[PDB]
Structure formats: structure tokens, C-alpha cells
Swiss-Prot record, chain A:
Compartments in which it is found: Cytoplasm
Provenance organism: Bacillus subtilis (strain 168)
Keyword Transferase in record: yes
InterPro entries reported in the protein's UniProt record: HMG_CoA_synt_C_dom, HMG_CoA_synth_N, Thiolase-like
Listed name of the protein: Polyketide biosynthesis 3-hydroxy-3-methylglutaryl-ACP synthase PksG
Active-site residues from the entry: E81, A113, H231
Gene this protein is translated from: pksG
Family statement drawn from the similarity comment of this UniProt entry: Belongs to the thiolase-like superfamily. HMG-CoA synthase family.
Keyword annotations from UniProtKB, A to Z: Antibiotic biosynthesis, Cytoplasm, Transferase
Catalysed reaction, written as an equation: 3-oxobutanoyl-[ACP] + acetyl-[ACP] + H2O = (3S)-hydroxy-3-methylglutaryl-[ACP] + holo-[ACP] + H(+)
UniProtKB/Swiss-Prot annotation, chain B:
Reaction catalysis annotation: 3-oxobutanoyl-[ACP] + acetyl-[ACP] + H2O = (3S)-hydroxy-3-methylglutaryl-[ACP] + holo-[ACP] + H(+)
Localization (cell): Cytoplasm
Protein name per UniProt: Polyketide biosynthesis 3-hydroxy-3-methylglutaryl-ACP synthase PksG
Enzyme Commission number(s) from the entry: 2.3.3.-
GO process terms (BP): acetyl-CoA metabolic process; antibiotic biosynthetic process
Length: 398, 401
């Protein structure tokens, strides 16, 4: 039996800001950013959260399904490092507002940015196991940033939602072609409620691939993969990481690398420039960007490398088809990103004062939707109305 | 096709416990609303313990009995908790290090109140079933501890660790006999760092079972299952839940229920009385207690019901064998529990002041292992892991004989 992504969609915020503009406004070093390949970062409003982001990313997928297909969704995993509770998973809320069927396992995975791939891989095994024939799974990776701080202009918000099933036109995985590698490392962690990392990212990038060769004999990092998606905090480092892979692993001459980069990796970097570091969903975004931006006149193989701080990592691969690229174009992802609202610095600064309001242990709060009066002509979208004795009230808005 | 299930399983039920009765007295609470709850002892995590500690100490005796080649086939480490130490860094990183597992391994944390355990387990079973890596294994470790009115004498600490593989003598699952039901409910949640629930538990208990009939035709809640393990915060409510299942679902006369309870459910309740509500691991504990305390002269079927607040739930089943009960006896779980240190109330009260030290956002702290002087040179067991210190958010653990 086959398994993989049947559909996939991105929600890249309601609002964003120009990252360069933000660097200047921080009276900051204009030059450390110049070729980190960053343009825009999505910003979650106070009336948004990981439930919001996941729902708004998943809905367009559910909407395009029949009622019989929606009812075969029996696994909802949300993957986050932006959780709202120690025990209550984001999946509960998300399950409600998508109106999924109650005959469904639901829960939250966590392992910094590896979360997304962990969920996805669990979902693929569900399919593969055939413990419930013809079922599907919805993995939704959702993360937002709330806040030395040269990290502020990169830190984004976003979610990608991945429908996994048995007829995957958009990314059919090569079952068992996996190189997972993990070890404890004093990497960047997230312990308060709201350098080493690069070494570790690259160790993982090499070791995952070697492990994949160990299981896929004949796998070659140049010819096997027509495109390559990486966990991409920001394009700059991925460019560096690809360069370092081509020398260290593929062992090819420095003269050819930029061409290899522009043909095989640059398409996956398109949407990440628009959103920022979206953590659990960074890789999925790169994969989506890759399927939208690249050329699939015939079926092509993409290699995906996932890295999560702490750390764990994995390198897997699958085949996307022309059918699959058609499917994915119907979500009009680019068009969605274009339409977001560009914050001004004075607006961004206001958002900063009111974002304290929604904090982690937040018990009660009512949210003003016209705090930035302009923001509120598309389909309905979910927003956080209020928190009451820790419970979260969301509302649809046209 | 291929088999999947628990090859081994072990419990760590704290280093220290207290007598729950004794605790009731010391709080001036009601000898009525209590004895009725089937609680005896609750495990208490010391400040120098945590979910990493608890998981490791639970997992070690399993790893130790494995050969080096079998240990190296462990390629999935999931830890299941609602007492996570970080928003991103999973407990599995630390646990993976101190078990010295092989780096060719996926590792991460699941979360969904007390459903976490079963979630992990089910993902692990599917890993095996999928055969995406033949002959591999998985280590699911559910670990939870309680920290700070009437919920204090029930709230325990503990972990169970489950080795999942292709030769599961101790609990071989009936593939596809599940089970699962979930919906959003304003149940009890855990949102600040440190009633409806019962309704929801019982709705789930009935619905999960009905869903299992839908997929397992001929499944009958009386004759199909020789024993029954439930997510058991405390024995009392499980007794109540079993009663309510036998009337509502199996539809049998009230006169015969207590006999059914004592033969099929009571063994699984043994160890839960010694530990308390251990959340993600409550069900696994009940299953382990069941496999230790019950009779398996021939292979028997056990039905397991998992519930997590919020909520999600599942009813699955599997076959344990006599071979499997042998395996599990070699971990001497009961004996382990007997050998814990009984806190006195005055000691318990000290533990309460110093447990603030290890809060959630804790950045730096050194831990005094002789804060309750007796505890360390009390037990003279194989070595056990303890939290030495936290330094710029990173955790240093130490083995102690």
C-alpha cells in the first residue's frame, strides 16, 4: 500500500512585517542581515494562536473534501513548541473547529522543530500499518513566536497542515527510506514560558543522509534527488548547509554548487522568505514551496531533511507528480501570502504591548479585534475571541 | 502478517511514598469520602527527581536485560508526559543519553493528558506493524509527577516503560481492534505552569467500546476479555466505572458485578493503590499490575481503556501469555515498591518547601541529596538516576548506588 501527502496547505499569518524595515527601526546592524535571504516575517496578532493558525491552514483542505473523505480522518496530530497547556493538546480545540469526526485519535508531539516530521512519520506508519484501511490522518504543524535579540527579525509564525492518506499525489514517500539520528545536545531550548545549533544542524544533515544510504543502497545526494527541502530557519543558513553538504558528502567541485543550489534548493526557499522561521513547520513550508515553485512535468524525487534542537533529525524522501502540483495550486498559497496585511512599525510596536495579554498561564482575557483597526475579502477565518478560566473561545470571521 | 506488542514493561513507582490514610488524618479530612476510594499509598517525587529520572529508572532494568544487539535495534523513543520541562526540548533527549541508546533513533514527546501513554504506544505499534524497519524496536516511556484541595492524597508520581517489538510475549495486540474516540471538552486542563471529568470518562468508556465492536464483530464486554485494565486515577472510580459498564453496556444483573469486578479488574488495581494517579502511565501500571497479579496458565485476553482529559480515549486489547508473565516477574515490580522509603508527615512537609526549588522555568539550582538525610543510604539497590543540578536551563543527572 502507498502512503503520503494527499494535500497540504500553508497559513502564513494574517499580518507580516518587512524584516529590513525592522532592522533599521531597532537602530541595528543593517549588514548582518544583508544575505541571510530574509524579506518578510509573519506576525501573530494577540487574537491569533496555534489553534487559529492550524485551523486556518487546515480548513481549505477539509473544505475541498467530500463528507465521506472527511469522516475517514482518524488521526489528528498537531506538532508544536508553542503549546498552551501541559496536558491539553492543541488537537482538541483544532478537532472541534474543523468539525472532524469523533472516531479519531488526537494528540500533540513535541521535539523543537523535529515535531512536524515526527507527526508526519507517525501518520505515514498509521497508513502503512493498515490497522484501519482507507483511513487518513491530518498532521498540522503550528508555531508562533512571542517575546541577544538579533533573533527578533527572523522569528515568524505559521502553520502547515498535511493530509496523509493512501492516494498521495503530492508527495508519496519511499517507505523505509529514512535516516533518523538523535542525541542530547545543549542546543537552543525553550524553558521559560515565552552557534552550537549550526554545528549540530550540519552534523545531523550529514549523519541523516549517511544513515539513509545505509538503508537505500545507490542513493546519491546529487542524482537521486531532483529537489531538496531543508528545515529552513532562514535561507542563508540553508544555502550554507547545502554548500557544506555538496563538498563534504557529495564531493563535487566548488564551481558547480551555485547552479545545483539554484536548480534544486532555491524553489523551496521561496515561501520561507515571506514568513520567517516557523519551526515545526519550516520543513513542510520548504516542501510546499518546492512543489509550487519547481517543475514537475514528470514525477520528481525530493529529499527532505528535518532538524530539531535538543536534538533529533531525519532525512526522508518521496515522489511528487504533476497531478500533485495541480492539487496544490488550487490552494493558491502564494496568492494567500500576497494578501496579508503589512504592519507598520508603530502598529508592530502596539501589537508588542498587547501581546503580553495572551501569555502562557493566561486565565481570563477578552480580545479587541479592532486594536489595529485596519486589519479586519476572503473566506472565513478563525480568531481567538477570549480566554475564560483557561478555556479558549474562538470565532469565525468573514 | 507480523506481530507487535509489549516485549517487556517495567514500573518505577518513586523513591519515596506516603501512607494516604496518615495524610488524611494530618489534613483533618473525612474517613467517609476516602476509604471508599481504594487508595493506600502515593509515590512522591523528591526535588532531586523528575520525569527524566523517573523514566530512566523505569527503563533501565529493561535495557540491562537486553543484549547489545537488541538494545541497538531500539529506533523509536517516545516519552509521554504532562509534566514536560521545556516547550521544545523533549524529555526523550535526556532519557536517550542516560540509557545510552543508539543515535540512529527517532525521539520526541507526546502529550494529551493521560491519553499520552496510549498514543505513544499506538504510534510504536504501527511502527512495528509498518515494517519500515524490520526487526526494530521502540521504547515508550510514560512519565508523570505531581507538584504544588481534596486531590492531594491521590496525586502520585511514576513511570512505566514499555519495550515494543515483533516478539511480544507479555502483551501481543490484536491489530486493528481499536477503540478510539475524541472530542473537545472543557475538562480539567493544566495551563498555569504547576465532575465533568467523570462524565466524559464514562461517555468515552462506553463509546470506545462500541467503536471496538463496530470493528471487532462478536466482541462482547463480558466473555471476550479475561481481565480489564482501565485508566485508573484511583481504584474507587474505576470500580464505579466498571459497574456502570456492566449495567449500561454488558447488561448483566447487579448481583453478579462484584464477582466480575474481583476476578477481572481487581488485579490491575493492585499497584495503583501503591502509587497513586500517575496520569500518562496509569493505564500501563494497571496493565502491569494485571499481568503480575492475575493468572496466565494459558494465554488470556485483556481489554485496556485509556482516557485523557480534553479529551481523547481508546479501547484496545491484546493477548498476554505464560512466557510473558515469567518475563515480567523477573523485574520484581512488587518487591521494588515494597523497598521504597516511607515519608513521615514532617518529612513530607519539608519536601513541600524545597519542591519550589525545581519549578518549571528553573534556570540554576544545585540539589541537596541529603535534605531528607535517610533516603539515600536507605535502599541499597542497583544504581538509580537523580537530578544533581540545573545550569542555564540544562540538566545534570548522576547515578547513585
Amino acid at each position: 500500500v502507498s502512503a503520503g501527502i494527499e494535500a497540504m496547505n500553508v497559513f502564513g499569518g494574517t499580518a507580516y512585517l518587512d524584516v529590513m524595515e525592522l532592522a533599521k527601526y531597532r537602530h541595528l546592524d543593517t549588514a548582518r542581515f544583508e544575505n541571510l535571504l530574509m524579506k518578510e516575517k509573519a506576525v501573530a496578532l494577540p487574537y491569533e494562536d496555534p489553534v487559529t493558525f492550524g485551523v486556518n491552514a487546515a480548513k481549505p483542505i477539509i473544505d475541498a473534501l467530500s463528507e465521506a473523505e472527511k469522516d475517514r480522518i482518524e488521526l489528528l496530530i498537531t506538532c508544536s513548541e508553542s503549546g498552551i497547556d501541559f496536558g491539553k493538546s492543541l488537537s482538541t480545540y483544532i478537532h472541534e473547529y474543523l468539525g472532524l469526526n469523533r472516531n479519531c485519535r488526537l494528540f500533540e508531539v513535541k521535539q523543537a522543530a523535529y515535531s512536524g516530521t515526527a507527526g508526519f512519520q507517525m501518520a505515514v506508519n498509521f497508513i502503512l500499518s493498515q490497522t484501519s484501511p482507507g483511513a487518513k490522518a491530518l498532521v498540522i504543524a503550528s508555531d508562533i513566536s512571542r517575546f541577544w535579540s538579533y533573533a527578533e527579525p527572523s522569528a515568524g509564525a505559521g502553520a502547515v497542515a498535511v493530509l496523509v492518506g493512501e492516494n498521495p499525489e503530492v508527495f508519496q514517500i519511499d517507505p523505509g527510506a529514512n535516516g533518523y539520528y538523535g542525541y542530547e545536545v545543549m542546543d537552543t531550548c525553550r524553558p521559560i514560558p515565552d552557534d552550537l545549533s549550526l554545528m549540530s544542524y550540519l552534523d545531523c544533515c550529514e549523519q541523516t543522509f549517511l544513515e539513509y544510504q545505509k538503508r537505500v543502497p545507490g542513493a546519491n545526494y546529487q542524482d537521486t534527488f531532483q529537489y531538496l527541502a531543508y528545515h529552513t530557519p532562514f535561507g542563508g543558513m540553508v544555502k550554507g548547509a547545502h554548500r557544506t553538504m555538496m563538498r563534504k558528502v557529495a564531493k563535487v567541485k566548488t564551481s558547480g554548487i551555485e547552479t545545483d543550489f539554484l536548480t534544486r534548493v532555491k524553489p523551496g526557499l521561496n515561501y520561507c522568505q515571506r514568513v520567517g522561521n516557523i519551526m515545526g513547520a519550516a520543513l513542510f513550508l520548504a516542501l510546499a514551496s518546492t512543489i509550487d515553485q519547481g517543475r514537475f512535468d514528470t514525477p520528481k524525487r525530493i529529499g527532505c531533511f528535518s532538524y530539531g534542537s535538543g536534538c533529533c533529525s531525519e532525512f526522508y524522501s518521496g515522489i511528487t507528480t504533476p497531478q500533485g502540483q495541480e492539487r496544490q495550486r488550487t490552494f493558491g498559497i502564494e496568492k494567500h501570502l500576497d494578501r496579508r496585511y503589512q504592519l507598520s512599525m508603530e502598529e508592530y510596536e502596539l501589537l508588542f504591548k498587547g501581546s503580553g495579554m495572551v501569555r502562557f498561564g493566561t486565565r481570563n482575557v477578552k480580545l479587541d479585534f479592532e486594536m489595529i483597526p485596519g486589519i479586519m475579502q476572503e473566506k472565513p477565518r478563525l480568531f481567538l475571541e477570549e480566554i475564560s478560566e483557561f478555556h479558549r473561545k474562538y470565532r469565525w470571521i468573514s
